[PDB]
Design a protein around this ligand. Structure first.
Ligand code: F05
Ligand code: F05
Ligand code: CL
Ligand code: CL
Ligand code: CL
Ligand code: CL
Ligand code: CL
Ligand code: MG
Lengths: 143, 138
């Protein structure tokens, strides 16, 4: 999957497509715009193909990763989604939505202590009061 | 033999339990021995092998990222530290080392983001002291 493909790329350490500037920036921006248009039209499969393409070319891109993670969560590939949300967080995503959505994923993965850690982190650090209410709703049901 | 012939049929590695747990532990220990002896190229072979066998093992991945960092392959190290962070979810040591990498890449705003993530979320006091020292210098 996405994570294993990234690890194998990193192991092999070769010269990469982006290292070659294989695709210009304004074309990558365009492909991202198309990926999101598929996504907004419900064309989850076209969106996934485009986001997977983007993440092969530039995996360490917050916006690409967040888009693919959302599609994995929709497709109930909850572990891949959780992992990619955490990648986005390490890369600098500047809010707690990756953590909130990872909590949802961990619940579906029957990992309630991980989920609790995610929602508590939202409540303790987010400045989105509505997101914190949603996080508390989830915490209240983990018993 | 029977075991290899079955593993290869299925392949076409860890899901199959191809290598016993205690032998994997031994290889990890030997990799760390090479590393501690300064034999970085030997350590790198062993950590690459470990990571191919179990690409979701945070400590195996951290070992390879440390070698990329030692070898001044700073972007490759930073990239792998992000995966390492993601697999363990709540250990900010890879993020700390990513901050070091970003400084060497002359990306101080990225470094500051890394060290701030450590300060705000880690419960590792010794790590946070190091992170704050860097923050004091940037
Ligand atoms: N449990 C988690 N701590 C930090 C984080 C970031 C993204 C997803 C999960 C977590
Ligand atoms: N697939 C995986 N994502 C996170 C993780 C940790 C340990 C083993 C497997 C996984
Ligand atoms: Cl937030
Ligand atoms: Cl075993
Ligand atoms: Cl060597
Ligand atoms: Cl590099
Ligand atoms: Cl996890
Ligand atoms: Mg074990």
């Amino acid at each position: 999957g996405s994570i294993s493909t990234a690890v194998i790329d990193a192991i092999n350490s070769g010269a990469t497509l982006k290292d070659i500037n294989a695709i210009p920036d304004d074309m990558m921006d365009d492909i991202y715009s198309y990926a999101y248009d598929f996504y907004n039209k419900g064309r989850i499969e076209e969106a996934e193909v485009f986001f997977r393409f983007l993440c092969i070319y530039d995996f360490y891109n917050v916006d690409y990763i967040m888009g693919l993670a959302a599609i994995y969560q929709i497709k109930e590939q909850f572990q891949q989604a959780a992992d990619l949300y955490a990648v986005a967080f390490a890369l600098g995503k500047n809010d707690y939505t990756p953590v909130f959505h990872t909590g949802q994923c961990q619940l579906r993965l029957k990992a309630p202590l991980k989920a609790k850690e995610c929602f508590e982190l939202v409540i303790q650090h987010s400045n989105d009061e509505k997101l914190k209410i949603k996080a508390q709703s989830y915490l209240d049901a983990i018993q």
